[PDB]
Scaffold this active site. Structure first.
Site, mmCIF file in Angstrom:
data_model
loop_
_atom_site.group_PDB
_atom_site.id
_atom_site.type_symbol
_atom_site.label_atom_id
_atom_site.label_comp_id
_atom_site.label_asym_id
_atom_site.label_seq_id
_atom_site.Cartn_x
_atom_site.Cartn_y
_atom_site.Cartn_z
ATOM 1 N N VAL B 79 -18.128 5.405 -34.864
ATOM 2 C CA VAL B 79 -17.103 4.476 -34.397
ATOM 3 C C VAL B 79 -15.739 4.911 -34.933
ATOM 4 O O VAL B 79 -15.546 5.015 -36.151
ATOM 5 C CB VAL B 79 -17.366 3.041 -34.911
ATOM 6 N N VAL B 81 -11.208 4.808 -33.959
ATOM 7 C CA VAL B 81 -10.014 4.621 -33.150
ATOM 8 C C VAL B 81 -8.942 5.565 -33.707
ATOM 9 O O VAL B 81 -8.766 5.656 -34.934
ATOM 10 C CB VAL B 81 -9.529 3.167 -33.185
ATOM 11 N N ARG B 87 -4.435 -1.194 -33.590
ATOM 12 C CA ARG B 87 -3.955 -2.542 -33.252
ATOM 13 C C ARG B 87 -3.692 -2.745 -31.753
ATOM 14 O O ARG B 87 -2.810 -3.514 -31.367
ATOM 15 C CB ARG B 87 -2.693 -2.886 -34.064
ATOM 16 N N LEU B 91 -11.071 -1.310 -30.630
ATOM 17 C CA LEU B 91 -12.355 -1.563 -31.264
ATOM 18 C C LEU B 91 -13.061 -2.731 -30.587
ATOM 19 O O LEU B 91 -14.239 -2.635 -30.281
ATOM 20 C CB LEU B 91 -12.220 -1.845 -32.755
ATOM 21 N N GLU B 116 -15.881 -0.501 -44.229
ATOM 22 C CA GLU B 116 -15.106 -1.466 -44.999
ATOM 23 C C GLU B 116 -15.755 -2.846 -44.825
ATOM 24 O O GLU B 116 -16.266 -3.169 -43.748
ATOM 25 C CB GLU B 116 -13.650 -1.472 -44.518
ATOM 26 N N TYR B 120 -16.555 -6.287 -39.803
ATOM 27 C CA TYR B 120 -17.656 -6.506 -38.867
ATOM 28 C C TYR B 120 -18.179 -7.940 -38.733
ATOM 29 O O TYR B 120 -18.812 -8.259 -37.723
ATOM 30 C CB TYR B 120 -18.768 -5.462 -39.112
ATOM 31 N N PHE B 396 -26.544 5.537 -41.902
ATOM 32 C CA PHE B 396 -26.216 6.100 -40.599
ATOM 33 C C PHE B 396 -24.858 5.549 -40.160
ATOM 34 O O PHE B 396 -24.237 6.058 -39.233
ATOM 35 C CB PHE B 396 -27.330 5.813 -39.569
#
Ligand SMILES: CC(C)(COP(=O)(O)OP(=O)(O)OC[C@H]1O[C@@H](n2cnc3c(N)ncnc32)[C@H](O)[C@@H]1OP(=O)(O)O)[C@@H](O)C(=O)NCCC(=O)NCCS
Ligand SMILES: CC(C)(COP(=O)(O)OP(=O)(O)OC[C@H]1O[C@@H](n2cnc3c(N)ncnc32)[C@H](O)[C@@H]1OP(=O)(O)O)[C@@H](O)C(=O)NCCC(=O)NCCS
Ligand SMILES: CC(C)(COP(=O)(O)OP(=O)(O)OC[C@H]1O[C@@H](n2cnc3c(N)ncnc32)[C@H](O)[C@@H]1OP(=O)(O)O)[C@@H](O)C(=O)NCCC(=O)NCCS
Ligand SMILES: CC(C)(COP(=O)(O)OP(=O)(O)OC[C@H]1O[C@@H](n2cnc3c(N)ncnc32)[C@H](O)[C@@H]1OP(=O)(O)O)[C@@H](O)C(=O)NCCC(=O)NCCS
Ligand SMILES: CC1=C(c2cccc(Cl)c2)S(=O)(=O)N=C1NCCCN1CCOCC1
Ligand SMILES: CC1=C(c2cccc(Cl)c2)S(=O)(=O)N=C1NCCCN1CCOCC1
Ligand SMILES: CC1=C(c2cccc(Cl)c2)S(=O)(=O)N=C1NCCCN1CCOCC1
Ligand SMILES: CC1=C(c2cccc(Cl)c2)S(=O)(=O)N=C1NCCCN1CCOCC1
Lengths: 396, 396, 396, 396
Positions: B79, B81, B87, B91, B116, B120, B396
């Protein structure tokens, strides 16, 4: 070499031993205040002959255990052997004499804080609470949308000088200690001592402040050398609202980079924040250690989880007897038996289980408790668990 | 700006993004091997127009949950960006598209490892396993009299080169992952990758060795800069004997001062030693995160503690429906209802409860789950608990 | 001991001296590429007799000075004296021979980067540019409402591999160096060298990436040991929009804690952010040093500030002559005179003034330039100032 | 929640807030002395209702600006919001009330020292002086042949106890502050405070000494923990001879490895030494911040560089009016106009320009000031420049 109860003339020598033996002795004045909790015949000394080369004592404490039951507890402390008289059997002699006096006096449990992790297991003490240091980088800390007390109005927390609100701290702490396993009654002299430590010292600790809520308080001070670190010496909260409100205030300390606290593994703090990682675990250690003096009295006095269904087993403690143990409706009955043991453990292991801090399953995996019945392990895990998470009151 | 499944020509751009975006990208060769676990339509890219400015994918995994039940699981990874396009909602757009594909494909859960801690939760992921680094100063380490496998004869552990015993590691790990909540099936390509990382690299990691027992293994290497530290990359054991035997061997590494391992909070290691403090907790962090895609399928698939007696309640997930939940005889039934909710929580909270790593009581104390019934909290704590402690398989 | 121009057979010995003398010699292959900028007769060696015990050379460079004037410049480099032959007058002998050749060849200025701050002043070199390391903690960095390029659309910066966009970097740098005092022409071989250093090395520096805008670029790599630090090796921007856009991209590197760059004291970066303190100055040092070889040619070639009104004075350089200096309409005339001096300074001081990095007033306050006329000081400060702030191109 | 001028009964609560809010509060006794500079109605408090949850005040100061003009200046200080009442608009309410009182009282400027760099820009304050820490490794330090005061005779500097030469320090500082932009009048009570801090404290700072010259002084003390570091707390010199003579004395401190000082970017010290690199810049930060309260009064009061020729323009301050600004013969006229703006900036930007510490060109490059005329930028740079470099007097 003789062992006996000390007379008033022995104490200057005992304070000398203490000053030279501990890492940072609290000093004669403080120790004299703590001594008011030591009963007659609660202390032993060893003399060479004649100077004092050994000492140990216990204090009369009240320990809360699961089910909000309060047990009289002998708190060992002020234990020292002179550097000149090591490896001479002096600790073993003092512990055996004190344990005989503690047992004959009717204490069902003794307790202590260990200076080193490897010494006390062989005398039947197992670690029973767990200390967790959390360090929060408050610059990034944001409270979750769900966190209590973030509506639109005045704040419930006040910011005060500790000595001017002694009564409110006493009353909040008293409510806390009665409802939490690990809680200890804090008598007046210990409040005197606590509030004396709140003042700044020249070339010493900085002044302490307090955050005061109706249902909780925090005491904190800036670190002596790292002026961007605030150390919370004590935080006691009886509702989730109070706990969250106090942490909102602490994270409001915009002069600080970090806030640290010694707390317990189930502290809800990380779940109060949008980033749970910000509450970093920087230190972990055993807290209160327990020796069960009388197995059936300790096991019957404690409350047990209602969720587990009634069951019976046979427990042998390695040199503490064998008992038929039946647990149901949150209570235990524990009676003598010579029937075959289903579970075996050393005395120290039982102390580690006693407040719910360690799982029987985990101790079995280390072979510290032996059984050939995994269903029984599951039942013990569930029964000895505590609805209210185990915490550490104060060091002694 | 368009979002779509990438074609073969998109991948050089994706690897470029990855190389520049991650802290230490595993590289094109490794990532191509991992890509074999990514199904057709398991990946999305965002193009500017046209270069690649965003990407995300999921792999097909098999996750073990309490009761030894194995669930198909979508493992999000890769994942990114572009730093040039932050911003801009990229995502959020990629996660929503992948979650739609994951749900339509029939996955009851998705999972990830968070770069981080604060990102999530708002997409419904809650941390569900806990990583514990233990550091043992082996110079002082002595095994307790009770510790398994210290009689008088030969040792059961061998000391071998990892690549020459691939089959035995595979078979030991396969047994482990099927019995432990958090276990993940490790396919052949991941064993290829693991064993490739075992070799020394010029100006890189040092060579790895293995300690091999019939019922467990450890893989370790000396630290690159601290040559008195051995890092255990992986230790998998299916019996207490194997676990203890492997630790005896590791503490036999007389060249080292310290042995470190990333393990879990219920690792029995500290109780194997005479001084439990020697196993220091040097680091603690969230491991696997979970998003429950389908609440009733996830809740019915899991096994529950037999110790708690049958009970029923009503659970609302904030944007995941309301259900009548009945738990008894270790199983749950979870059906639609419009009856008043007794418990409410966000989706991420349910993921944190799902494997047993976090107690409902503790989450309630943070107001992350709401109920006016403390008895229900106790029942949820006990029912969602796992007989076998939750562990983390691989990153992973 | 003899001094002469080296023959091809001298170079293996010279590379040996260099390998053993410098802190981290760039190596024979790199140095051979740089050697293509060294003219015939641009190098001297000292032999003992016979091995090489001393060496020095100059390269043919093009230096931009205020008013966008480009001067041929002799760049001293590859200067070494064997550790076995220190304090024997060898440096002084080599510098005097090279300066004679540089002067006879028609260079109006020579330049160098100093390995130590105390060596070159006595040979007439003064520090003329100033290097500033800025370290930005990007976790807190927010751009000011006024900062360019934050509307609502696509981004202007691309994120690319350096070697695939060589032509665009060349063209951007060429525009930059022609408009900035301190700029140096970068020939093809130095672009070859620069792009070779962009690739990762086994047990070495990590791979470099680029952020590319029509009017600027940045080259960066993650630090080898601190994986949360990105080091910008070079950032060249010809418009404020490009500069700001590139910094927006760099602060978009969410894997990093910190971004560092070697820049100049007038870098606008701190004013781009809401908190100007976040751009911390972590290091400061002299950059390019200058020796004015021909005073009247150097002083007449440079452009001067239009703001100051026409004035005349008499300048003595301690062993470089005395001149009537008249400045007006942004130009100077500088002719021989025996009239009484109004200002006196050593040659090195004039080099420090020459690009605008140091104020005459400040040098007067140290008594490095002498005058009894404070009005004249004010006029010199204003006239020698540069509209475009002085910068450092690249190290040699 | 109410806002008002505090009564005498409010001050114990205010000192409590201060003790708990600042990193290292100067204490009630010191703050009471500083309070004598606070005029009637110069302070505001916010009460909850009722305890004090907010406060701020200003002192009456005299600030020297370019052209040796002294302006009455409101010095904001003692600003705090309780950690319990953050994000409630309390700072904004207090600043707006104080600014209204400051403006109505006739102050043309206000000033402060910022605790954090990101707070004060939005209230119209811009950083206006720059602090430079220099650290000199004095073991290598040698003075240049040109440095003043190294003939052959007695020394001009004395070495004295600070409290016995109060009058001479006062008189030297008074001369300094009147001639230097950034200078502040230091009244008697601040000299009392300064000299009180000169004495050693048990478990505190070490005793201070002074080096005294007819035209300058330095106050220094050995660092509390690094006994090879001497910290110069203050060095004030009115001639180059005094400055150099004092540094000769400081480098004569043969017990020390290093001498450190907080100074300004144009300190001539590095040019006094044969190796200019020995004066290392170890720290850099904004010093005094300025808010221009009345634009035309501030701009007309200041002197401007004579070197630039007469010119006129139109300046808009974003919410501070639009003015016709004409500068010539070192003076400005600044009158109301509705003509089209040629230059635009926020109020804080003007404060940053006002003492000469920041160039208009540099601020333009960050888009903090807008114009389509580069010639005008050059003229503003030159006109706002200060003949005498801007310095920071003392912290408040
Ligand atoms: C540990 C202690 C009291 C010294 O005791 P001692 O008199 O040397 O101990 P003894 O001679 O009775 O030894 C008895 C056994 O304990 C063991 N033992 C005691 N202290 C030990 C140590 N520090 N390391 C290893 N073994 C130790 C001995 O090996 C011996 O083993 P054995 O029975 O197999 O022979 C001393 O180190 C001390 O002062 N500890 C502080 C205790 C403390 O602060 N407690 C908290 C409340 S204040
Ligand atoms: C975080 C991330 C992907 C950037 O995403 P993005 O496109 O800027 O995020 P979006 O524009 O979709 O933002 C949507 C929301 O998420 C929030 N958000 C996303 N990343 C954030 C961050 N790093 N800090 C704060 N907020 C963030 C935004 O504030 C926004 O909030 P809103 O809905 O209230 O407006 C990027 O930092 C990244 O590359 N992360 C790595 C992820 C990873 O490694 N995952 C593990 C598997 S590889
Ligand atoms: C400095 C240097 C070249 C050695 O030179 P050297 O031959 O010992 O110097 P010389 O014998 O010519 O000395 C001449 C004068 O310089 C002085 N000097 C030279 N290097 C010096 C040093 N490191 N420290 C103190 N003084 C020094 C001598 O004291 C002498 O003074 P004097 O004229 O009063 O007698 C050597 O240290 C070196 O290799 N420097 C690297 C230069 C460099 O990297 N430059 C950048 C481009 S590659
Ligand atoms: C900063 C401060 C005073 C707290 O103020 P506060 O009452 O929370 O601020 P307010 O509620 O008035 O906030 C108003 C605005 O300022 C912003 N703000 C204030 N302090 C901030 C901080 N520390 N971080 C981010 N934003 C901040 C708010 O975001 C808000 O923005 P908005 O207008 O877009 O809503 C406090 O941190 C403090 O005590 N600072 C010390 C100041 C100091 O020492 N000054 C030097 C002289 S003693
Ligand atoms: C309360 C007290 C003491 C005490 C208690 C009762 C009577 C008397 Cl005379 C003294 S003490 O032994 O002096 N040290 C004390 N607290 C600090 C010691 C805590 N230990 C715990 C184990 O890790 C080392 C520090
Ligand atoms: C397996 C894997 C990747 C992968 C997986 C599937 C397909 C492909 Cl093309 C790549 S990765 O994104 O390249 N990085 C990977 N492991 C290391 C990243 C671990 N993260 C976890 C979160 O804290 C940062 C490190
Ligand atoms: C370009 C170059 C060299 C060079 C140049 C021309 C011809 C030849 Cl044969 C070599 S060098 O001397 O080898 N070292 C070089 N750059 C790195 C040295 C930079 N110095 C600057 C002063 O502080 C120490 C490092
Ligand atoms: C002079 C003074 C204060 C003062 C001034 C006037 C009246 C009164 Cl009652 C107090 S103070 O707020 O107590 N703190 C003071 N000086 C030290 C604070 C300096 N700050 C500057 C910003 O970075 C943090 C430190």
């Amino acid at each position: 070499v003789t062992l006996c109860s000390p007379t008033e003339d022995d104490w200057p020598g005992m304070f000398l031993l203490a000053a030279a033996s501990f890492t940072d002795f609290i000093g004669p004045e403080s120790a004299t205040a703590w001594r008011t909790l030591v009963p007659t015949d609660g202390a032993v000394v060893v003399r060479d002959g004649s100077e004092v080369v050994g000492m140990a004592l216990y204090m009369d404490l009240r320990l809360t255990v699961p089910g909000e039951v309060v047990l009289p507890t002998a708190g060992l402390s002020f234990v020292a052997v002179a550097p000149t008289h090591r490896r001479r059997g002096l600790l073993r002699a003092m512990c055996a004499e004190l344990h005989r006096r503690i047992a004959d006096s009717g204490y069902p449990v003794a307790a202590l804080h260990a200076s080193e992790g490897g010494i006390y297991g062989r005398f039947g003490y197992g670690p029973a609470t767990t200390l967790h240091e959390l360090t929060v980088d408050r610059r990034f800390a944001r409270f979750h949308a769900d966190a209590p007390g973030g509506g639109l109005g005045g704040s419930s927390v006040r910011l005060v000088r500790p000595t001017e609100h002694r009564g409110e701290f006493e009353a909040i702490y008293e409510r806390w200690r009665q409802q939490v396993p690990g809680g200890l009654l804090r008598p007046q002299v210990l409040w005197d001592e606590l509030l004396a430590e709140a003042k700044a010292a020249p070339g010493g600790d900085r002044e302490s402040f307090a955050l005061l809520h109706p249902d909780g308080y925090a005491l904190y001070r800036v670190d002596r050398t790292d002026l961007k670190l605030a150390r919370v010496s004590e935080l006691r909260a009886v509702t989730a609202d109070a706990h969250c409100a106090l942490w909102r205030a602490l994270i409001g300390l915009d002069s600080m980079e970090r806030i640290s606290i010694i707390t317990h593994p189930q502290d809800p703090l990380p779940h109060l924040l949008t980033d749970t990682r910000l509450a970093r675990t920087t230190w972990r250690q055993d807290g209160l250690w327990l020796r069960i003096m009388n197995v059936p009295a300790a096991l019957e006095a404690r409350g047990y989880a209602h969720e587990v269904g009634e069951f019976s087993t046979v427990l042998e403690v390695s040199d503490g007897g064998r008992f038929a143990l039946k647990i149901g409706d949150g209570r235990a009955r524990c009676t003598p038996t010579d029937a075959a043991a289903e579970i075996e453990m050393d005395r120290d292991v039982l102390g580690s289980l006693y407040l719910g801090a360690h799982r029987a399953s985990t101790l079995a995996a280390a072979n510290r408790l032996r059984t050939k019945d995994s269903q029984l392990l599951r039942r013990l895990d569930a029964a000895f668990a505590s609805d209210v998470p185990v915490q550490t009151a104060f060091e002694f």
